Amino acid sequence: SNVPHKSSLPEGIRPGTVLRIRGLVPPNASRFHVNLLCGEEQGSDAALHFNPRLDTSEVVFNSKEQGSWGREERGPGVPFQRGQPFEVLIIASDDGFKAVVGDAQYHHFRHRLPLARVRLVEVGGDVQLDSVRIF
Amino acid sequence: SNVPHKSSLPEGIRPGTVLRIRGLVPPNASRFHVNLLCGEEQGSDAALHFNPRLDTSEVVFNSKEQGSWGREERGPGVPFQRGQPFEVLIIASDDGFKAVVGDAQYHHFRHRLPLARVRLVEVGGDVQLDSVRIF
Numbered sequence: 001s002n003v004p005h006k007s008s009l010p011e012g013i014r015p016g017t018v019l020r021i022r023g024l025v026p027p028n029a030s031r032f033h034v035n036l037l038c039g040e041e042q043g044s045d046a047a048l049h050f051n052p053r054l055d056t057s058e059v060v061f062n063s064k065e066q067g068s069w070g071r072e073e074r075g076p077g078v079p080f081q082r083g084q085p086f087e088v089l090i091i092a093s094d095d096g097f098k099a100v101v102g103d104a105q106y107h108h109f110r111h112r113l114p115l116a117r118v119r120l121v122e123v124g125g126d127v128q129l130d131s132v133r134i135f
Numbered sequence: 136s137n138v139p140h141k142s143s144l145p146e147g148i149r150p151g152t153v154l155r156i157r158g159l160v161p162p163n164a165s166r167f168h169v170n171l172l173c174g175e176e177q178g179s180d181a182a183l184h185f186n187p188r189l190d191t192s193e194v195v196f197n198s199k200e201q202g203s204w205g206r207e208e209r210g211p212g213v214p215f216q217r218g219q220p221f222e223v224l225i226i227a228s229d230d231g232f233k234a235v236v237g238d239a240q241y242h243h244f245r246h247r248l249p250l251a252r253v254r255l256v257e258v259g260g261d262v263q264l265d266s267v268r269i270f
């Protein structure tokens with residue numbers, strides 16, 4: 001399908017950056033993720049880790065700093081379904097990331113690391129990607 | 136009847152604010168516009184005047200301060216077509232507005248007036264507005 005998708009962001013990202021991700025959640029998906037990483041090394045810091053878990057019915061947001069994960073935040077319910085397509089907008093603003101799913105504001109994740117450290121977007125897990133666009 | 140559509144921006148707009156306009160260009164459309172205004176009074180300043188012209192086949196960007204227009208910036212081609220539907224994204228960033236038309240970054244307009252004064256959205260002219268959503 002789309003396999004782990006990687007998009008580089010050399011200049012980083014600033015408030016007013018929009019990540020639009022469209023794809024399908026396959027019939028037997030357990031979970032997938034969208035990470036905003038700070039480098040290409042494995043286990044690199046994550047300004048944001050968005051993780052819809054269909055197997056447990058939760059959507060988790062977290063960060064990873066200096067090798068250790070922070071405290072997990074959970075969104076309101078699971079707006080994703082196995083066998084259904086989706087569209088997610090992850091908008092960077094001054095104070096955090098707005099996560100919009102299916103045309104509705106879903107969760108706001110206050111910044112934990114400086115937006116300026118982000119260098120790569122990675123998408124992986126049980127999802128079949130249509131497209132990942134960054135505006 | 137061409138009564139323009141008017142939409143309030145309750146918390147105003149800041150870097151990270153996304154305007155999503157969906158519509159369809161009428162068959163005999165001449166031109167249409169999206170205005171970001173600073174007040175509800177006829178003749179208020181326009182932080183942004185985005186005006187695609189099918190007849191002159193050119194898209195004009197411009198601001199209007201204290202009654203008079205300013206330096207007009209044109210964009211690359213006409214990403215709109217008569218009788219066809221379009222989806223436009225206007226993204227406010229720290230240094231300007233990014234206009235995205237159907238999956239592609241179209242033009243970047245640097246702030247002339249301050250984001251802080253913008254208070255409403257106006258869409259008028261030859262266009263069938265389907266919806267305006269602010270994220």
Ligand SMILES: OC[C@H]1O[C@@H](O[C@H]2[C@H](O)[C@@H](O)[C@H](O)O[C@@H]2CO)[C@H](O)[C@@H](O)[C@H]1O
Nearest residue numbers: 168184186195196197198204205206207
């Ligand atoms: O500046 C935006 C403003 O343009 C007016 O038309 C301009 C036009 O851009 C230019 O080709 C010509 O030389 O001058 C005209 C008038 O100053 C439009 O009439 C107005 O609706 C806006 O779109």
